[PDB]
Design a protein around this ligand. Structure first.
Ligand SMILES: NC(=O)c1ccc[n+]([C@@H]2O[C@H](COP(=O)([O-])OP(=O)(O)OC[C@H]3O[C@@H](n4cnc5c(N)ncnc54)[C@H](O)[C@@H]3O)[C@@H](O)[C@H]2O)c1
Ligand SMILES: [K+]
Ligand SMILES: [K+]
Ligand SMILES: [K+]
Ligand SMILES: [Mg+2]
Ligand SMILES: [Mg+2]
Ligand SMILES: [Mg+2]
Ligand SMILES: [Mg+2]
Lengths: 248, 30, 255, 309, 33, 57, 56, 123
RNA sequence: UGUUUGCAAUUUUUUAUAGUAUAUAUCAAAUCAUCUUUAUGCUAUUCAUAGACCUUGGGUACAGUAUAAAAAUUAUAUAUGUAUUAAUUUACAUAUAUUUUUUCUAAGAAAUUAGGUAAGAUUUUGUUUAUAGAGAAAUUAGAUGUAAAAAAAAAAUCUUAUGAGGGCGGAUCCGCUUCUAAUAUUUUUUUGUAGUUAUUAUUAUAAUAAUAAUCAUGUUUAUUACUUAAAAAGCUUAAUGGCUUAAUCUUGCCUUACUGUUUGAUUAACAACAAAUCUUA
């Protein structure tokens, strides 16, 4: 619906926006002007490349809507037309370049990388449209980097140290702040001492985790999504950290 | 005005068709 | 192709186009937007079933259980009942045909949806005028201490609509006028019509007195009725005529 | 259920989607050509008036959201990548970064009247006028905490240029009006002088500049190119001054005439404007923040470096 | 334009009729003035 | 009588902005160019990438 | 009220100096009542007290 | 002067008398836009109430943690509420280096770059 | 056929039919200059048609991923080449004005125009924060807060009523008078404060309790109501008073800045008269 709405609004702007004056961008009798007129002629006078063929004036201006199952509104079609137009169609001397001689433009990169296909959970470029979470196994139960809070340091100063001792210092990270975003309280057994874990949100900009020579008894790590966390973390350990999750 | 150009355009079409016809008869004769 | 089908454009469009419901027109943005409203109305209806069953649980609950007694039990169901009425309107407020049927005057006024748009339209231009007449003509506080109209009333003399507070000729205002009323709430009630002339000059006491020119009671009215002829109040329609229509008049010299 | 019975039975939102056989025969281009005649016009002919002549005038004007209205602007055309970033990654960080805890049973804070009143036993204190704003003559707005219900965001941006030399060379104002037209995508409004200075040859009440204003998505897109395509290209740029801010949440800063021609819209057609006529601008960012520090924190979230000066 | 021609003729007749009444009444006013 | 002003907006296009990092995104602009490649941007600047080492009396 | 802000009498009555905090909170008015024992400002909900002023 | 005429021509086409007129839709056409408009705003309502729900949930996760942290004792010989009082300090939160620019500068993109992520980054 | 081409959608009115006043259609006016050739041309391809690689031509295309099948089509004069005629007749093309489609040199870039009327706006001055060039002094953007699901009930103190034609003395006249209604006032006796979304706890996805948010079916540039001391700005000229709920400002239409006569006042204009001032019909 968003694509259909954008395309629907792009044509309503064609009927209300002032026409496009090529004189203000292209000088008459130049490589750019000739290149623009040739491509404009193929688009049937429409100076835009992402609204198909539609004339805001004339006797056929009322027929602006598109029927069901149309490709013109898709994002793939929009990007395809904009890329096929970025290629020069006229040499610097004003002569049209042959069809087979035109140099195509470098196409964009695919949204799904090789990691998505391979399914490597230790890669940070996987699920580029979702938020990944660093989960580490302890010699076994999966969890986040955790540790005891000494008497000299605080909550944020302790989280920074544990992260460097567990995941190494080769990560460009930033602790959001001192406020904890979630807590998991394990009541005591009247015996065993309870635990009041306080989690601090963190964000990684670049780098990769390193478990070599870690101080804690850590074995493996993996960057999981919000959907894969509930399948890995325990029920009680997940119900307490799910409130910190985001939309994506 | 619009239909005026229409009628005057169709009128010129007949004249062009009369020229196309008559000139064709000469080409065949030659 | 007769007038029973609509205007010329419809009878003309209904002869050169294909027979297909308006909601089934194959348009991309129109069918992607209709699906958003479709699966939404299904959620509103799923909520009405959830809230209706919640009142049963509260209804079948001893008032003693509630810390506030029976007083706190009704204020909770009241908020629930009012919440359902809003869901019955939001389920059809986005329907494109409910708007078409209402604008064409073919809307069923017994349903909350049409009575909602009917009042929303009346409160846009007609209420602002009648509200002004009550103030500029000093109908308040003269006749009543305070008055806020809640229904529409359009009176026409001999088939001619009269503007609110318009000077009419003594000959035009000689027969009982036809009241084109319209109520916006459900149910059937008995109405009482009164026509009062509040400017009769009393020269003996140097003041004005009010005179009733018409009075009728026990007139059943529902949101489906629109026209009421004050001529036949006890003959055709049910009602008790307290005073027949008196031709309005004004002596020369008085305002 | 009686409630469901009160709903529209002839629901159009519950009809099945169109079919392929009926869609293949739906050819609007063929209907007009096949008709071979002009369809009679409808009897409903109401057009929005050119002037609003009151709330009780017979002919009324429709809202701006009505397509036929004279003020209708086509809706959004795309989702700016900057507004999607903020609402996705940064909206929660600002809330988590700046956050103060309130006990569960904390009583609501009642605001104090900033215009004091005289209270006492003196018979004169009764009808005394309210005291003046203590300190400054105008009351400053109070800061609102950054909670989950108040997330500072960008609202609009005003790009204004002042060309005093346009009073002598009228061609300097025409070029300035065209630069801001392409840079922002709107029709700038000409501005006039308000003071006279014989030393500067400034005359009041004469056109000496222009201005624009972009709202909604148009503002996020301007910041998208400004921060990621214009400012990085300025030579020896230190950042936005740390002193910018009107104490109410609006950040202001200007660009040199050599930095305005770096805009992708101006450099593409640079040879169309006369030489030495591309002016600077005073870019004013208006945000929903309620303080001077909340604005800097908002711009810091969008990748705007601030240099101390 | 099979059945629409009849409706068009009805529209044309409605217009040609008014144009006749307007010209038939405008002439009466010019005689009274 | 309050005048109802109309919007005077110039023609706008949909442009693909390819950053120096290779990433692309669509934007709304007035220039007719379809693809705008940026050789210098935040992804290629030291003020925005202080930790980046490649750009780095 | 006159052109020069002079307040005249529009009917035959008795002058009254009063304050109507309902109409305007910080204004003082002058009125004319038909009965000397009337008290202005009249309550907004009471009927208008008017005289015919006509002879038959 | 010739170049300036190219500018005046650009403003002339934007004159109120030159710009296109207000739209003129029929009923079936007007109703079709009425649903597209009635649905788009509803779509925004769903995206808003969803976006505002996550903000309320994330906020309630902190209130529960901070509230609990305010009652904890320790670590060691530390009075109750110490970590809470230290967790509410805003030292450098509103400074110049508050948020790292490397994170804020990286915005979303329709498609990734030649190198989506940099795993070879070294301190 | 004015009005956007798929279909009863604004207000009033005309006419006609049914109908016993209403209903439907139709017409006119108001609101608005939306631009309209159903293809006659273009485009692509092919087939003829010239010979040192030309003009003019006939076909083909089958259109929702809309299409070659209109992204904008005029007239006229001169003159040339091809070509044609009884002819500067016709067709074609250029040579270049000249006109129409107003669609291409920004009036929504320009005046401080001051009265009548209607609508809309409501601190504009100064002070102050910030802002390429820009400084003591140039432009621009800002400078209060609250509310917007919703109340219900008991008594009392007045005041009002062209309320009950109240009662009693002299229907609507007047002083005493109970009752009822309404506004206001008590800090008053309280009762209720939900629903929705989400969190936490208990209980068996639901229920209950607590906590938090909650104007929102609406282009978030939301909107609406209320509030924001005083001075200052503005209101034809000094000074004083006044106006912000208009006497200011903006815009539309206008020119009552009208003709004759006339009322009551300025505690009987100026401590007389006269020339005056305001107001009424
Ligand atoms: N708008 C309302 O009706 C409404 C209702 C309740 C509360 N609020 C409050 O007002 C503020 C803003 O409301 P909002 O969140 O609904 O505004 P919004 O962000 O959804 O709309 C702002 C602008 O963004 C555009 N937009 C919205 N979604 C888009 C998309 N997917 N792609 C491209 N453009 C898009 C809109 O059309 C509009 O131009 C918030 O504080 C909100 O809680 C708004
Ligand atoms: K939204
Ligand atoms: K003030
Ligand atoms: K005026
Ligand atoms: Mg000022
Ligand atoms: Mg300065
Ligand atoms: Mg004036
Ligand atoms: Mg005297």
């Amino acid at each position: 619906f968003e694509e259909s709405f954008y395309f629907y609004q792009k044509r309503l702007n064609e009927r209300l926006t002032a026409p496009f004056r090529k004189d203000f961008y292209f000088k008459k009798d130049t490589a750019a002007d000739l290149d623009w007129r040739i491509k404009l002629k193929e688009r049937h006078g429409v100076p835009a490349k992402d609204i198909g063929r539609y004339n805001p004036r004339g006797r056929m201006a009322w027929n602006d809507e598109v029927l069901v199952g149309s490709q013109t509104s898709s994002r793939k079609h929009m990007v395809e037309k904009l890329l096929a137009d970025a290629e020069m169609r006229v040499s610097e001397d004003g002569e049209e370049i042959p069809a087979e001689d035109r140099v195509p433009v470098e196409k964009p990169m695919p949204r799904r990388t090789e990691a998505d296909e391979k399914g490597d959970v230790k890669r940070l470029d996987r699920a580029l449209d979702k938020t990944l979470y660093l989960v580490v196994k302890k010699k076994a139960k999966w969890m986040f980097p955790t540790g005891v809070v000494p008497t000299d340091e605080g909550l944020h100063e302790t989280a920074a140290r544990i992260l460097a001792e567990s995941a190494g210092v080769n990560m460009n990270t930033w602790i959001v702040g001192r406020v904890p975003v979630a807590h998991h309280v394990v009541r005591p057994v009247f015996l065993k001492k309870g635990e009041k874990i306080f989690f601090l949100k963190g964000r990684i900009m670049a780098g990769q985790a390193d478990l070599t020579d870690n101080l804690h008894d850590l074995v493996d790590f993996k960057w999981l999504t919000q959907e894969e966390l509930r399948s890995t973390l325990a029920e009680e350990y997940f119900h307490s950290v799910k409130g910190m999750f985001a939309e994506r | 005005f619009l239909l005026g150009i229409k009628e005057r355009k169709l009128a010129k079409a007949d004249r062009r068709e009369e020229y196309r016809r008559r000139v064709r008869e000469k080409r065949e004769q030659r | 192709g007769g007038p029973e089908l609509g205007s010329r454009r419809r009878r003309a469009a209904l002869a050169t186009t294909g027979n297909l419901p308006f909601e089934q027109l194959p348009y991309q943005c129109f069918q992607d937007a209709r699906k958003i409203l479709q699966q939404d109305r299904a959620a509103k209806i799923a909520q009405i079933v959830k809230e209706t069953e919640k009142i049963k649980l509260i209804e079948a609950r001893d008032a003693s259980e509630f810390e506030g007694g029976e007083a706190a039990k009704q204020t909770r169901i009241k908020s629930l009942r009012k919440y359902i009425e809003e869901l019955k309107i939001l389920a059809d407020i986005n329907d494109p045909e409910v708007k078409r049927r209402f604008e064409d005057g073919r809307g069923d006024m017994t349903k909350p949806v049409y009575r909602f748009m009917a009042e929303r339209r009346w409160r846009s231009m007609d209420y602002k005028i009648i509200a002004q007449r009550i103030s500029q003509f000093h109908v308040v506080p003269d006749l009543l201490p305070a008055f806020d109209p809640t229904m529409d009333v359009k009176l026409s003399f001999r088939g001619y609509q009269v503007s609110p507070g318009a000077i009419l000729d003594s000959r035009v205002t000689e027969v009982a006028p036809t009241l084109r009323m319209q109520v916006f709430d459900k149910g059937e009630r008995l109405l009482t019509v009164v026509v009062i002339d509040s400017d009769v000059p009393d020269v003996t006491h140097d003041n004005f007195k009010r005179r009733c020119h018409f009075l009728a009671a026990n007139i059943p009215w529902d949101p489906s009725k629109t026209v009421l002829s004050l001529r036949s109040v006890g003959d055709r329609v049910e009602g008790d005529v307290g005073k027949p229509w008196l031709p309005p008049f004004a002596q020369k010299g008085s305002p | 259920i009686p409630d469901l019975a009160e709903l529209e039975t002839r629901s159009a939102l519950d009809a099945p989607i169109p079919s392929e056989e009926d869609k293949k025969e739906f050819r609007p281009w063929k209907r007009a050509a096949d008709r071979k005649a002009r369809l009679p016009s409808s009897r409903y002919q109401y057009h929005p008036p050119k002037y609003n002549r009151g709330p009780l005038h017979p002919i009324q004007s429709p809202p701006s959201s009505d397509p036929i209205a004279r003020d209708f602007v086509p809706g959004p055309f795309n989702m700016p990548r900057l507004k999607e970033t903020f609402r996705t990654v940064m909206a929660s960080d600002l809330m988590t970064l700046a956050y103060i805890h309130t006990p569960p049973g904390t009583p609501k804070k009642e605001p104090t009247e900033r215009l004091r009143a005289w209270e006492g036993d003196s018979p004169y204190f009764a009808n005394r006028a309210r005291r003046a704003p203590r300190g400054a003559p105008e009351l400053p707005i109070r800061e609102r905490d950054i909670s989950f219900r108040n997330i500072p965001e960008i609202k609009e941006i005003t790009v204004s240029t002042f060309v005093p030399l346009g009073l002598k060379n009228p061609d300097l104002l025409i070029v300035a009006r065209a630069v801001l037209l392409a840079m922002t995508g709107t029709m700038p409004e000409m501005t006039r002088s308000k003071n006279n200075v014989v030393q500067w040859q400034l005359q009041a009440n004469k056109p000496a500049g222009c201005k624009t204003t972009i709202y909604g998505n148009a503002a996020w897109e301007f910041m998208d190119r400004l921060i990621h395509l214009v400012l990085p290209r300025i030579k020896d740029w230190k950042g936005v001054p740390a002193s910018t801010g009107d104490g109410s949440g609006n950040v202001q800063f200007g660009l040199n005439p050599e930095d305005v021609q770096l805009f992708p819209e101006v450099e593409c057609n640079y040879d169309m404007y006369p030489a030495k006529m591309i002016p600077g601008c005073h870019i004013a960012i208006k945000t929903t923040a309620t303080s001077d520090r909340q604005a800097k924190l908002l711009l810091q979230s969008l990748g705007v470096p601030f240099y101390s000066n | 334009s099979s059945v629409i021609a009849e409706l068009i003729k009805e529209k044309l007749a409605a217009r040609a009729e008014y144009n006749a009444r307007q010209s038939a009444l405008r002439k009466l006013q010019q005689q009274k003035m | 009588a309050t005048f109802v002003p109309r919007h005077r907006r110039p023609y706008q296009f949909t442009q693909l902005v390819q950053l120096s990092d290779g990433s692309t995104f669509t934007v709304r602009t007035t220039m007719p160019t379809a693809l705008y490649k940026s050789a210098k941007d935040s992804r290629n600047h030291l003020l925005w990438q202080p930790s980046d080492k490649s750009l780095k009396a | 009220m006159g052109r020069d802000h002079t307040i005249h009498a529009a009917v035959a009555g008795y002058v009254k100096y009063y304050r109507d905090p309902q109409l305007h909170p910080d204004r003082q008015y002058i009125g004319v009542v038909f009965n000397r024992n009337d008290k202005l400002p009249y309550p907004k909900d009471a009927p208008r007290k008017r005289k015919l002023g006509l002879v038959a | 002067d010739p170049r300036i005429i190219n500018i005046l021509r650009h403003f002339a086409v934007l004159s109120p008398k030159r710009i296109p007129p207000p739209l003129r839709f029929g009923r079936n056409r007007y109703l079709r836009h009425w649903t597209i408009h009635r649905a788009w705003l509803l779509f925004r309502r769903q995206q808003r109430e969803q976006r505002e729900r996550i903000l309320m949930q994330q906020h309630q996760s902190m209130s529960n943690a901070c509230e609990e942290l305010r009652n904890t004792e320790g670590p060691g010989t530390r009075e109750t509420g110490y970590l809470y009082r230290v967790a509410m300090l805003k030292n450098g939160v509103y400074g110049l280096k508050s948020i790292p620019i490397e994170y804020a500068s990286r915005a979303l993109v329709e498609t990734p770059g030649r190198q989506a992520w940099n795993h070879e980054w070294k301190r």
